[model samples]
Target: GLVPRGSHMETESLPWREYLERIGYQGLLNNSLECLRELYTAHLRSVPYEMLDSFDGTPPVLGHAESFAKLVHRRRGGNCLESTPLFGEFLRQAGFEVRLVPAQIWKVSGEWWDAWDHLLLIVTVDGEDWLLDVGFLMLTFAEPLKVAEGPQEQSGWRFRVAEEEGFPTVSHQGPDGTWTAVYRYRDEPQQRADYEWIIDFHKSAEDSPLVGTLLCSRNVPDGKLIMIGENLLHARNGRVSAEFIETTSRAEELLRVIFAGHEHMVESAVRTWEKARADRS
Candidate 1:
């Protein structure tokens, strides 16, 4: 029963037992807020968020079978649209009330609105709804935050969920001490196919960062681990260390550890490194 085989494209439920092992979560599997937070944190610590998982100009597959297979069986990470729903499925199987919500990103440079480019999970624990995202965008939350407007913490990062026209928007404390927009999400639950339009939008658009930008950010014990473009960034206690992967071999070494020692991911990482360097020069 632990073995993951065949085409996962036909399954509705995920292998929860195997999934728990993948995340290395060894706690009680009840539907308590504690269990939800534990699963959310453990997921980020183990599963990773790899934007390069769909780097080949291909739209991601958000179905249960495919997403679960890639992450648990194949031991690889995927983009938000793919992984977030998988997390929802896992929560449902574990007897939690989970909803799949889609969100559009504030491009930081592109100004206000953009396509529906991200995924988030709203989990109701004891009638209190909490936003739990393992999607791993630029901002990382070490634990789930209550859906209402309030301040939250993730070690080195400070975050708050303020509403924009009654819809909850996630914003983090910026470098200049201002609340910067991370991404804005809707309250309604969404089916995976509802986001299919973004697949082409992100792949075909001239400015979509997913196709060429190699990004993998996962929360570690005390801080965050990141790889964006050709650079590696680490944050610990509000202090960040940065390194430009100037050498191909060096990039490979780090990516191997992140990708669960998969060679295919290394090949893609090398492609992204070349692309990131070529564009800079």
Candidate 2:
């Protein structure tokens, strides 16, 4: 609804300038590696990683205009489809060589998630490919992880990228200092529309975790905040604390502030709280 979709005019392009303003990045304006890193971190901190709208079982729209309206203008957050594609568009407009790739998560319980369970970006700058993912629902990298071997440290978090069994794999550091695989993706480039097929599996499939809980997360000054169903978790300096959200009234007020005054998001989260509460009781 922001702009007409059918116009073939490249004159009215994607709003990269306005998006930079929205995320409030203060780094260089070019497609240099540092500029790309700054933009990735700025977006991670500014936009949240919320999947509240998917609680109702209706998949969300992943188009540029819809994601732009919800995330940039409405000051909200969404899953990989929204964040990945929006940033991919912005990166392309900013002159970065970007390709959207489908990745499958490595579930901590021992098996891999469904094929193409996630979407992330591979940006090539100065002949170096970097992995950028702002869609993870918890505290992740502060900048794009370089697609190389060994540890790439940024803002106290460590990430590693390597070819594992022929597939490019991304790994995270656990408290024990052992490396754990987060997800793996092939190097093939895919259209943004390719990911639309999995949204239904995530939102409606009976085995999906998203339908049974409420999740909202955002980066704070020195840490991040994550709410799962009624439990709210705060992580900082490699430590975490937790508390219960208590009631729907409390969840309404908490999510209103957490989601930055988005009325629809707040109401949706409140209804989820009520339903999950009833199911528990």
Candidate 3:
């Protein structure tokens, strides 16, 4: 039901062949649930969740053609706003009905504030609404999740969807048997243009989290790698390990080797952090 009305001829304008290749999806292409699973998994394995460009003062171009270039040709990953629209186009081209849904994250103090903080996708398959999001970085779903109540397992973790005030809230089950809310969304189909203001705020605002953070994440076959500030975490197979990169050079190495990001970008982020720290001191 979240699938928006209209024939997306815009999907025809994208170079889907190159896009599929960018994600390393060489499997059978069809509009079946199985095909969706393959495509979703390949995207998670191939593309990363990165903010280098944004942190480096050049936010990704959100236009269809430009975004395709930045994502596929350049082989760079982006956040929810950058990644979801591109993936939505891919789904539309593949004959699946797609809708762009707006979502806000749940913070640590049991509050939700950042309005329209994220973008996600909903694809209708056989009259059932399935949530498909590839931009969630480390804790993303590897397969399309049906909008229902139950334990949906993927890649060694379990998630559940619960209806709260007419919205669906996704919760991740921790190893300690506790559930934490990740995000929630309303099914009111939204247009990509509606999110441009928030995107700009994230790009240029001084206090924005994306402005000065050296963050990059990607989901590997066996685990997840996350680089947040000076900490680098490797969580896989129910085990966790973390190391701190105290120097700029060490941060660059970790960014390059673990996150597949550029060194110059890492240096820029480090400089920003240094400036902020000096100001505080």
What does candidate 3's lDDT look like per residue over 1-281, in tens digits? 34333325444566788988888897778898888878888887777777767665666666666677788777777678778888888788779999998888877578885666787899998898898888775565667888889888876778888987778998888789888788899877777567767767765566776665666777777678887776778877655688976777776566565545334345555565455344444
What's the ranking of the predictions by TM-score, best on top? 1, 2, 3
lDDT of each: 0.75, 0.76, 0.74
Q: Could you tell me how far off, in angstroms, the CA of residue 130 lies in candidate 2 after the best superposition?
A: 1.0
My TM-score estimates for the predictions, one after another, are: 0.86, 0.85, 0.84
Query: Model 1: residues >4 Å from true position, as ranges?
Result: 1-13, 260-264
Which residues of candidate 2, in runs, are more than 4 Å off?
1-12, 26-28, 242-257, 260-268
Q: What TM-score does model 2 achieve against the real structure?
A: 0.85
TM-score of predicted model 3? 0.84
The CA lDDT at 125 in model 1 is: 85
State model 3's lDDT.
Answer: 0.74
Of 2 and 3, the candidate ahead on TM-score is 2
Q: C-alpha displacement of 209 in model 3, angstroms?
A: 0.7
